[PDB]
Amino acid sequence: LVAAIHDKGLKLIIDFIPNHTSDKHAWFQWSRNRTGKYTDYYIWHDCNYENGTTIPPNNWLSVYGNSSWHFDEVRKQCYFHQFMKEQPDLNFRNPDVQEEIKEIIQFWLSKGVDGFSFNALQYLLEAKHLRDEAQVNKTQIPDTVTHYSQLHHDFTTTQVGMHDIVRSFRQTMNQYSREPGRYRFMGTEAHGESIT
Amino acid sequence: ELGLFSGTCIIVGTIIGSGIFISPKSVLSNMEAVGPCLIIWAMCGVLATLGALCFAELGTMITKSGGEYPYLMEAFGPIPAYLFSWSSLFVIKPSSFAIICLSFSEYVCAPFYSGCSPPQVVIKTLAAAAILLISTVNALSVRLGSYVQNVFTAAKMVIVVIIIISGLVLLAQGNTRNFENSFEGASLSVGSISLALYNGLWAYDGWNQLNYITEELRNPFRNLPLAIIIGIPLVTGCYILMNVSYFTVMTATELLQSQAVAVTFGDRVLYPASWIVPLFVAFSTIGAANGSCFTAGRLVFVAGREGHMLKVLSYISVKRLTPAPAIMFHSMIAIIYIIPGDINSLVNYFSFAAWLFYGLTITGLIVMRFTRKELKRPIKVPIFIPILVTLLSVFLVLAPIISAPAWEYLYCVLFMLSGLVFYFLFVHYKFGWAQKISKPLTMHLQMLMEVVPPE
Amino acid sequence: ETMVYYGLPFIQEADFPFNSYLSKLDKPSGNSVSEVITSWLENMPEGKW
Ligand SMILES: *[C@@H]1O[C@H](CO)[C@@H](O[C@@H]2O[C@H](CO)[C@@H](O)[C@H](O)[C@H]2NC(C)=O)[C@H](O)[C@H]1NC(C)=O
Ligand SMILES: *[C@@H]1O[C@H](CO)[C@@H](O[C@@H]2O[C@H](CO)[C@@H](O)[C@H](O)[C@H]2NC(C)=O)[C@H](O)[C@H]1NC(C)=O
Ligand SMILES: CC(C)CCC[C@@H](C)[C@H]1CC[C@H]2[C@@H]3CC=C4C[C@@H](O)CC[C@]4(C)[C@H]3CC[C@]12C
Ligand SMILES: *[C@@H]1O[C@H](CO)[C@@H](O)[C@H](O)[C@H]1NC(C)=O
Ligand SMILES: *[C@@H]1O[C@H](CO)[C@@H](O)[C@H](O)[C@H]1NC(C)=O
Ligand SMILES: [Ca+2]
Questions:
Q1: Using an 8 Å Cβ cutoff, are A106 and A172 in contact?
Q2: Where is this chain's protein located in or outside the cell (chain C) (predicted)?
Q3: Which of B186, B379, B401, B407 has its CB 3.0 to 4.6 Å from that of B36, i.e. a possible disulfide?
Q4: Which chains touch B (3 or more CB pairs under 8 A)?
């Protein structure tokens, strides 16, 4: 298909979403086992788990709405996920994960893909201190906050070093966009709330 | 004297020029597939060998100083000899000078317009500045003509082996995707096959002017047909081994995008120093133009004896022994050619007129060998090679006009017949008033340009 | 947070941020001085000064 597209004079760009993987990914199966360097590919933390009910490290919520931490039986720790529990978030603060996302960008550009569309980019980094958010309704009981819209998201979206990760993806795509007529396009999806 | 190894080294360097850098785009835009456009470089490569072999016959048996003007005088009479002298001064030689200089500005201005095509005003203002500079240097001096020639034929061959070696190494690494499913969209037709033989044969231009080497060949009769049948077939083998080195790197859809084909190649394969291709090709292309301007005064001398062309054109300047009126008239016609047309509309216009006179010559070869002339011929070619060159050229001259008619052919036919009118009203009838328009013209020109008859 | 002022391999910034961590030692111990030296040199980017 990539050959049939280039012969027509067209270009092909594909969706890329580097924030999370599935909990069936090989990286996560090794990480829960604490295997090798994969023990820190994901964001883990200690949490008390007794009688099926877990207290999370903070009040951070998922985007689809519930506690954003989930207990893992093999690791005996909680892993972070912005979206549903089937999507653990990669840990982009250690340099091992960024070299993996750098080889996937290189794998698809070698096949002739003409560029990418990066999704869920504001969720790349989170605050390291893991402090609780500020509720929208301050006089609300802290055990009924279960909706993503009931919090101010200052520690889970658009953190400080987030733009230097996206600028690093652009440099990896510059090694392939040097020959004239084969520039690699990079586009991102916009923040729904802000235009600045 | 020059041996057989040097007997080919002159002819192979003569054939390979700036045609291999401009024609691939044009032969592929008519074959539409990698497979057939590879057999065109062989089919026209063989057709150029039988041409140069037939020209070896006339070059030995006639044995006159004129290039090809004698061969039409000896066979058909004085009207085709004059009609060729007319066209080779207004059509064949000026337009071949305009295509070489139009193809030198496609390679100088292609890097500065990366990703897209340059405007037409840039590739004509730069071509008009090359024609005037090439024709001015070759008029002020002769040493500077041959000063930079041996270096300009080095850069020509340095690139030819760089493209080939790179296109072979990449073929070992398995980059076979382009010619895997060849012939799939081949548009073979008398329309396309003819128009694609024009552009393929233009890369072989220079096989007719190959007879001068016999004078210094060690054993001409025994070695020249050998130096030809192993020299040119060595070059067609170096073209399909260079056109293959294009399709190994880029695809059939990206070829037609750029006019400078070798510039698209140097960016993809030679990234650290990719400026080497537009720099070296600009050297060789301006060197091949230097070879055209040198021979401009050649044919007008031999045709100036028989009173066919004006004798003032053969006059030489005294301060510098350079055919100044021949050159500045040879370039002034080229300037009028780069203005209306572009490379593709001139390769058709050139290879049309050039190929009817290429036919009339080798038909005169058999016609003289069949009935009229019984003189001895030192080297003899079999009878089946000339009948092929004429039956091929009669297809090349007549199929494009009927199947793919264009306005370029009309202006070509109107030029020769205009010379046919100049035959009767100026040289055939010799009117009285016709003289008094010539005599005051020549010496005033001599007065203004301080030129002198050669001998 | 201090090492961000060194810049990135493609965006240039301060030539170096001033290391004031030696100016903080109030007691001359061997491991107090050794901790400042290795904390700056391992956290620093690759080709920096
Ligand atoms: C968080 O997850 C719980 C499940 O543990 C959700 O609660 C269930 O929601 C569905 C809605 O279709 C109900 O049918 C179930 O009865 C609920 N379960 C219980 C035990 O009440 C809860 O809605 C989620 N929070 C969200 C989506 O904000
Ligand atoms: C924010 O939520 C609080 C509840 O946590 C609202 O305060 C009152 O809460 C009591 C709880 O027993 C209710 O009985 C009252 O009806 C609530 N007052 C209302 C609804 O006016 C508080 O009003 C909420 N504020 C906003 C802006 O929604
Ligand atoms: C007269 C000629 C041989 C002079 C030039 C010599 C040097 C500069 C040439 C000769 C053959 C060339 C190589 C041919 C093929 C390749 C493979 C390609 O993927 C990268 C460039 C590379 C590796 C070329 C580098 C330059 C090279 C080594
Ligand atoms: C994790 O450890 C268990 C226990 O030995 C083993 O059965 C399983 O295969 C391991 N999985 C991975 C992905 O290492
Ligand atoms: C144990 O589980 C039961 C489930 O009904 C729950 O009510 C109880 O609070 C749990 N106890 C602890 C200490 O978690
Ligand atoms: Ca994340």
A1: yes
A2: Apical cell membrane
A3: B186
A4: A
Structure tokens at C32: 């107090």
Ligand at minimal distance from the CA of A138 is 2
Q: Report the 10 Å Cβ neighbour count for A40.
A: 14
Return the closest-CA partner of residue B160 out of B15, B369, B311, B312. B15
CB burial readout A62-84, b (16+ within 10 A) else e: bbeebbbbbbbeebebbbbbbbe
Query: Is the Cβ of A171 closer than 8 Å to some Cβ of chain C?
Result: yes
User: How far apart, in whole angstroms, are the C-alpha atoms of residue B94 and residue B102?
Assistant: 12
- Choosing from A146, A148, A151 the residue with most ligand 1 atoms within 8 A of its CB, the one to mutate for a pocket test is A146
First to last CA, chain A: 38
Which residue's entry shows tokens 């023990």? A39
Q: Is B245 exposed, middle or buried (0-12, 13-18, 19+ CB in 10 A)?
A: buried
Ligand 2 pocket check for A144: Cβ under 6 Å:
no
Residue B176: which CATH number? 1.20.1740.10
Interface contact flag, A167 C4, Cβ < 8 Å: no
A126 closest CA partner among A37, A32, A44? A44
**DSSP symbols for B374-429:** ----SS---THHHHHHHHHHHHHHHHHHHHS--HHHHHHHHHHHHHHHHIIIIIIS
Separation between Cα atoms, residue B390 and residue C32, nearest integer Å: 98
A30 ligand 4 Cβ < 6 A? yes
* CB-based burial, B83-116: b 16+ in 10 Å, e otherwise: bbbbbbbbbbbbbbbbbbbbbbbbbbbbbebeee
Q: Name the closest residue on chain A to residue B268, using Cα atoms.
A: A179
Which of the residues C10, C12, C13, C43 would you substitute to probe the A interface, choosing the one with the greatest number of A C-beta atoms within 10 Å? C10
Residue A145's CB: how many other CB atoms inside 10 A? 19
CA A103 to chain centre: 16
Using N-to-C axis directions, what is the helix angle for B324-338 and B296-305, rounded to 10°? 120
Give dist(CA C22, CA C33) in Å, integer.
7
DSSP state for residue B270 in the 8-state scheme: -
Give yes or no for C4 touching A (CB within 8 A).
yes
- Per the structure, the complete domain to which residue B413 belongs is given by 4-452
Helix (H) or strand (E) holding A71, with range, is: strand A69-72
Which residue type occupies A157?
Answer: T
Q: B and A: touch, per 3+ CB pairs < 8 A?
A: yes
Is the distance from the beta carbon of residue A136 to the nearest atom of ligand 2 less than 6 Å? no
How many other CB atoms sit within 10 Å of the CB of residue B269? 20
Q: Is the Cβ–Cβ distance between B102 and B339 less than 8 Å?
A: no
Instruction: Give the pair of three-digit tokens for residue B419.
Output: 């010379």
Measure the CA–CA gap between B437 and B355, rounded to whole angstroms: 34
CA B128 to CA B130: how far, in whole Å?
A: 5
What distance in Å separates the CA atoms of residue B343 and residue B101, rounded to the nearest whole number? 10
Do B390 and B363 meet the contact criterion of CB atoms below 8 Å apart? Answer: yes
A14-16: strand order across its sheet: A14-16, A115-118, A185-188
Final resolution, Å: 2.8
A window 34-63, beta carbon within 8 A of C: none
- Distance between CA atoms of residues B246 and B262, nearest Å: 8
Structural domain count of chain B: 1
CA A60 to centroid of ligand 2, rounded, Å? 22
Q: Which residues of B380-408 are buried (b: 16+ CB within 10 A; e: fewer)?
A: ebeeebbeebbebbebbbebbeeebeeeb
Query: In chain A, what residues touch B115 (CB-CB under 8 Å)?
Result: 180-181, 183
